[PDB]
Design a protein around this ligand. Structure first.
Ligand SMILES: CC(=O)N1CC[C@H](CN(C)S(=O)(=O)c2ccc(-c3ccc4cccnc4c3)cc2)C1
Ligand SMILES: CN1C(=O)N[C@H](Cc2c[nH]c3c(Cl)cccc23)C1=O
Length: 259
C-alpha cells in the first residue's frame, strides 16, 4: 500500500533542473525531510501501488503520491549530487575503483528491475542518480516505465531496433544496449558521438553498426570492460547477455581486480 500524501505535508518548493526531463521540485516534508516531486484517479493509484513495490538500494523509491484537484504528483527520495553525468564532469574526478562500484550497482539495480518484470526502456546517465557517498540509484524521471502517469542526446543510448521503429516492443536486452553506452560514458566522461552530422545520418549509422568511439577514452579502461561494452552493444539483441549474466562475470572481476 502507498502513502497517499497532501501538499499540506510539504513546506515547499525549490524547483530544480532535472537534467533534461523538464521541471521537478525539491520539497520539504514537514515530518520526513527532503523529497523530490514530479507534478482516471483509480487507474493512476493502481499504478502508483505497482511502482511503490519497487524496493532495492539501487532503485529510487516512490515514497507516495499527491493526487489533489489540479495537481497530480509522484514523490520520490532525493539524491544529493544529481545524475551520473554531472558528477563525472566534476573537477575532483572519480577513481577507477569507484567507477567499478557504480557499474556493479547499476547492474544490481537493473537485475532487480527486470526480476520484477519492469523494463526501463530509457536507461542513461540522466536516470542514474548519486548520493553524497557516491552510491547510485536507478530512476525513471521521464516515466518511460509507466502508462497512465506518462499520458499525463536522448537517442544516444537507445537500442538500434528502436531507432526508426517505434512499434517494436522493448525487451530486457533493450536495457542492455543502453548499459553498454553508459559504460562508455563512464570512462569517456562525456556524451558519445560528439562529431555527429545529423540525427537522421547518425541514426542510420547506428542502425548499420557504428558505436561510440572507444578511442575517446583518454583514461585507462580495463580491456575486460571494453569487451563487455562491445558485447552489450551488439546489433543483434539475442547476442547480448542478461543483466544476471553480466553480473555473474563482472562481480568477481570487480572484487578481484578493483576491490
Ligand atoms: C545547472 C546546474 O548548475 N546544476 C544542475 C546539476 C548540478 C548538480 N547539483 C550539484 S544540484 O543542482 O545541487 C542537484 C540538482 C538536481 C538533483 C536531483 C534532481 C532530480 C532528482 C530526481 C530524483 C531524485 N533525486 C534527484 C536529485 C540533485 C542535486 C548543478
Ligand atoms: C519516477 N520514479 C522514479 O524515478 N523512481 C520511482 C519508482 C520507479 C518507477 N519506475 C522505475 C524504474 Cl523503471 C526504475 C527505477 C525506479 C522506478 C518513480 O516513481
Amino acid at each position: 500500500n502507498v502513502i497517499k500524501m497532501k501538499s499540506s505535508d510539504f513546506l515547499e518548493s525549490a524547483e530544480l533542473d532535472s537534467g533534461g526531463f523538464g521541471k521537478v521540485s525539491l520539497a520539504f516534508h514537514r515530518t520526513q525531510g527532503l523529497m523530490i516531486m514530479k507534478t482516471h484517479n483509480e487507474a493512476l493509484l493502481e499504478e502508483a501501488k505497482m511502482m511503490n513495490r519497487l524496493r532495492h538500494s539501487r532503485v529510487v523509491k516512490l515514497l507516495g503520491v499527491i493526487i489533489e484537484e489540479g495537481k497530480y504528483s509522484l514523490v520520490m527520495e532525493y539524491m544529493e549530487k544529481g545524475n551520473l553525468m554531472h558528477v563525472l564532469k566534476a573537477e575532483m574526478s572519480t577513481p577507477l575503483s569507484v567507477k567499478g562500484r557504480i557499474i556493479l550497482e547499476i547492474i544490481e539495480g537493473m537485475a532487480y528491475l527486470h526480476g520484477k518484470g519492469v523494463i526501463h526502456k530509457d536507461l542513461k546517465p540522466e536516470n542514474i542518480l548519486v548520493d553524497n557517498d557516491f552510491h547510485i540509484k536507478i530512476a525513471d524521471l521521464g516515466l518511460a516505465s509507466f502508462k497512465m502517469w506518462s499520458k499525463l542526446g536522448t537517442l544516444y543510448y537507445m537500442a538500434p531496433e528502436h531507432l526508426n521503429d517505434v512499434n517494436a516492443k522493448p525487451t530486457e536486452k533493450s536495457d542492455v544496449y543502453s548499459f553498454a553506452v553508459v559504460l562508455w560514458a563512464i570512462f569517456a566522461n562525456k556524451e558519445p558521438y560528439e562529431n555527429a552530422i545529423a540525427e537522421q545520418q547518425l541514426i542510420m549509422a547506428i542502425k548499420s553498426g557504428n558505436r561510440p568511439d572507444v578511442d575517446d577514452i583518454t583514461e585507462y579502461c580495463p580491456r575486460e570492460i571494453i569487451s563487455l561494452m562491445k558485447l552489450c552493444w551488439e546489433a543483434n539483441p539475442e547476442a547480448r547477455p542478461t543483466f544476471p549474466g553480466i553480473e555473474e562475470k563482472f562481480r568477481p572481476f570487480y572484487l578481484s581486480q578493483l576491490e
